Amino acid sequence: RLLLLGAFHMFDVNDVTAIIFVVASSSYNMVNRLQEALNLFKSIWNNRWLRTISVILFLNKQDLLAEKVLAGKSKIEDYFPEFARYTTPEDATPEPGEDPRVTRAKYFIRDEFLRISTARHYCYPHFTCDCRDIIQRMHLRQYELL
Amino acid sequence: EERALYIVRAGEAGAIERVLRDYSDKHRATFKFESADEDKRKKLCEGIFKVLVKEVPTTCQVSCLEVLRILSRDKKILVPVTTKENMQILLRLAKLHDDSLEKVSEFPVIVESLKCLCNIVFNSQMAQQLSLELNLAAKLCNLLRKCKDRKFINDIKCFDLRLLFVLSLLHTDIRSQLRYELQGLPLLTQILESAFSIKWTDEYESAIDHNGPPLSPQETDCAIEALKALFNVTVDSWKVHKESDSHQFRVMAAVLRHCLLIVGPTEDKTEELHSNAVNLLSNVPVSCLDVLICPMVYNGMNMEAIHVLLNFMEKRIDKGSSYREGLTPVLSLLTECSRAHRNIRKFLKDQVLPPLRDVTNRPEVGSTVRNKLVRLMTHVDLGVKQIAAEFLFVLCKERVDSLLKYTGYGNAAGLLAARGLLAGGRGDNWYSEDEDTDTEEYKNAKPNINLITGHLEE
């Protein structure tokens, strides 16, 4: 059985194998909403009665986060001061076909959860929410004038 | 610009050549312009077209076209020079009206005119409408036909194909005429076959010499341009298919299979050629993709192209940049090939997922292909992780238990959540009857294996 603490036989709210945790990735500017989620995750991860149970993490509403970041009316630095001096990890992959701001925001949001777990059970984070258009857009960007 | 125009208005043909050669040498590598001298550039550009009307030696024409190509890099000065007469002059100079190639001294003029046309068409949008009204694609195809087999006409072919690629990328009606009313597929396929020098042994088989010399940069450039144009030609209509086109779609796949088994002059050119070949292969209907295998062997067949594709995918996985535009096409192609044909799936299963012998370490810790593909399943990009999970799902005959045996429930949660199989089960397509394939060590260990992590834990 799998417990669903977020908001095989899966039941919400000793026969426990894994935990599925769901949070909204675009709630960084609501009065915060990521702070409560991170506090809850830190509370559930350090429990002594769950020292052998793994956690699967779902991060949905990614497109809304991308739109909010691209709009520019709201900035993460006004809510998370440490974001100003953040540097990308060593396992990051550059994406020339995307705006760097959304990539940095995604990596920062993942690392916020990952550092709690890294600092025996494990954690698995998953982001949740066309090949023709990807190639066509690439051709238009790499064209060089003679 | 002031000295130039002063002499340009003068008749004499030596001074103009020297002035324009000096101007070309000075500004040969400039791509940024200032707004202080816009009018002085516009006046010179207007004078250049006025000069080209009269009859002048070839040396002056080449210099004028070079200066015009240098000046065409700026969009702000292309407003008052995009009329019909200028485009007609450019087409006349490129022999698109005058369609004779009996003189060898006029080739650089044609090349320069094609370059100027490419620049002007890309920068200006009125030029696209004028090209549509002037029937440019038909004349380009006529020139391509007239260039069937001769000598010293490689650059003309490359820049003709480049102009065709630009026109088909920017405008849709021209794409429709090229696909349907102009018969571009056989012409481009013949161009590719002439580039590769393909000799047929059977209806859809070609002779391969493993000790043959590599290609040349000229042929590599021609092939790259032809593949890039063919991608745009066949992208408009692929969801509708009828039996009348199967022969033409199979010849193309045979040519591409020949392409996947050769090498270029350097490694970068080879990678570019193979990437463009994969991009074109991604458009062909799947029911015509069975000519990739001939009667590395599996069940009395030849399975080398799949090995080449697997090595390409692994080498692109090894580097850690541009996963969205460097991994999705080949993974999608492999998945679609495996889903429809049996021999390809059975050959890939025992190469990517050999029978399990070691359960001491975690699936994502290691340096094999399986470890890399499992590590790719938790990326921050959606398409990459989805296609990476779907490939391994297809290779396991769409059964949940066989997937959890090799990757673990933790790494496979995304696909199970997306497809609704989050509580077990199987897919919809049926492949064949289950068989036993278990190693002896795993049978002893199996009772002490964690489902979520998928390894034997001490």
Curated annotation (Swiss-Prot), chain A:
Cross-link (Glycyl lysine isopeptide (Lys-Gly) (interchain with G-Cter in ubiquitin)): 68
Domain of life: Eukaryota
Region (G4 motif): 56-63
Binding site for GTP: 60-63
Pfam families on file: G-alpha
Subunit structure as annotated in this protein's UniProt entry: Heterotrimeric G proteins are composed of 3 units; alpha, beta and gamma. The alpha chain contains the guanine nucleotide binding site. Component of the TAS2R14-GNAS2 complex, consisting of TAS2R14, GNAS2, GNB1 and GNG2; within the complex interacts with TAS2R14; this complex plays a role in the perception of bitterness. Interacts with CRY1; the interaction may block GPCR-mediated regulation of cAMP concentrations. Interacts with ADCY5 and stimulates its adenylyl cyclase activity. Interacts with ADCY6 and stimulates its adenylyl cyclase activity. Interacts with ADCY2.
Full protein name: Guanine nucleotide-binding protein G(s) subunit alpha isoforms short
Organism this protein belongs to: Homo sapiens
Gene it is expressed from: GNAS
UniProtKB/Swiss-Prot annotation, chain B:
Transmembrane segments: none
Location within or outside the cell: Cytoplasm, Cell cortex
GO cellular component, one term: centrosome
Effect upon mutating residue 162 to A: Reduced ability to fold GNAL
Expression tissues: Predominantly expressed in the mature olfactory sensory neurons and also in a few regions in the brain.
GO biological process terms held by the UniProt record: G protein-coupled receptor signaling pathway; sensory perception of smell
Pfam families associated with the record: Ric8
Residues modified to Phosphoserine: 432
Disruption phenotype: Death during early embryonic development. Conditional deletion in olfactory sensory neurons leads to death on the day after birth in the majority of the cases: surviving mice do not express GNAL (G(olf)-alpha) and are anosmic due to a strong reduction of mature olfactory sensory neurons, resulting in difficulty in suckling.
NADP keyword on record: no
Keywords for the protein's UniProt record, in alphabetical order: Chaperone, Cytoplasm, Guanine-nucleotide releasing factor, Phosphoprotein
Single GO molecular function: G-protein alpha-subunit binding
Subunit record text: Interacts with GDP-bound G(s) G-alpha proteins GNAL and GNAS. Does not interact with G-alpha proteins when they are in complex with subunits beta and gamma.
Protein name: Chaperone Ric-8B
